[PDB]
């Protein structure tokens, strides 16, 4: 691997469902690359009969200097209209990945708990979901990292 992930911090946690995800990412690039790096955030929800996946946001970073790199990725929140009501207040996953020329080489997975912010709503969840009352809590200190060997240049 030409790129090593050195640190990753969620800056705003817990947060509203509709708040952007702020990831402070520290990495090192060990030699010059021809292309930019593409950071992506993916939502994965699990309902009874299928998963729902959403590409939440992506950003191209480059040209990448050799050595240490650090930035905050502020990723757009999910499109709630694409998520079943029951899944909006469930445990879900987000996957933060980096790719090179379209090839994913690192993936950082997080558990996320979503619940209503009022006792009455938690115990009597309404038929018509009230997204402004949903709070997310990312399990930010226990990242689930996967690395993949890729072709670089």
């Amino acid at each position, epitope marked *: 691997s030409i790129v*090593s*992930l050195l*640190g*990753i911090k969620v800056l705003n946690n817990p947060a509203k469902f509709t708040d952007p995800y702020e990831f402070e990412i520290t990495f090192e690039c060990l030699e010059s690359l021809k292309h930019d790096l593409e950071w992506k955030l993916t939502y*994965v929800g*699990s*309902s*009874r*009969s299928l*998963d729902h996946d959403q590409e939440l946001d992506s950003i191209l970073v480059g040209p990448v200097p050799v050595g240490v790199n650090k930035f905050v990725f502020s990723a757009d929140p999910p499109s709630a209209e694409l998520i079943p009501a029951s899944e909006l207040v*469930s*445990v*879900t*996953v987000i996957l933060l990945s980096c790719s090179y020329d379209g090839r994913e080489f690192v*993936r950082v*997975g997080y*558990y996320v*708990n979503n619940e209503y912010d009022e006792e009455e709503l938690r115990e009597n969840p309404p038929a018509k979901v009230q997204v402004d009352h949903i709070v997310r809590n990312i*399990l930010a*200190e*226990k*990242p*689930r*990292v*996967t*690395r993949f060997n890729i072709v670089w240049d």
Partner: antibody
Amino acid sequence: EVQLVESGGGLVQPGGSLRLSCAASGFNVSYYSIHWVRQAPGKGLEWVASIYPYYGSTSYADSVKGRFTISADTSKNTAYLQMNSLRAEDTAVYYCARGYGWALDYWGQGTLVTVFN
Amino acid sequence: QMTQSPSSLSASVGDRVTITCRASQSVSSAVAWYQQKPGKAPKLLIYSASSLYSGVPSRFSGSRSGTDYTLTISSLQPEDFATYYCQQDGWSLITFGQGTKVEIKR
């Protein structure tokens, strides 16, 4: 050439302690989660403890919480399991394994811990 | 948090075999399947419910329905008689199923 090599297993009496080590080869422990999973003869796999990268945060099985501590020394590229207050029921082969997302990809060959009166 | 059955089954080479585990949650990322043979460490087959691990034969597959997770071997080969374990990597705890030993008929 990824390898995890456990050591430190041996005979110990109840109430005693042991420190297991897991020496990583072919990879840097700072980039991965590391896990201990044990198995008694003829029995199933039982997860013991996990440590996560970047934070060094930890998780423990209820059966070992308060007695065992998992840690890592990234400069030595080694993970550890400090086992205090050992009980007869802790006898098992102890595997160290590397995290692969939510799964475990490379497992060591195991070190035997034998608690005896 | 994770229950596996049965503890054993008997089958023949060429048979389609399925093993199911019931998890406490439906999160697909959390479940993996392992193979273990006597005297050896476990080997990863499937991760995140349905992803085939590098180098594992295509006859192994994983699926999910609700909180039920299934390992399928499309056609047992002679080297597939072994014990199979599911794993749930949960919010707080990792739980392994009790294991299913696949034995050979005669």
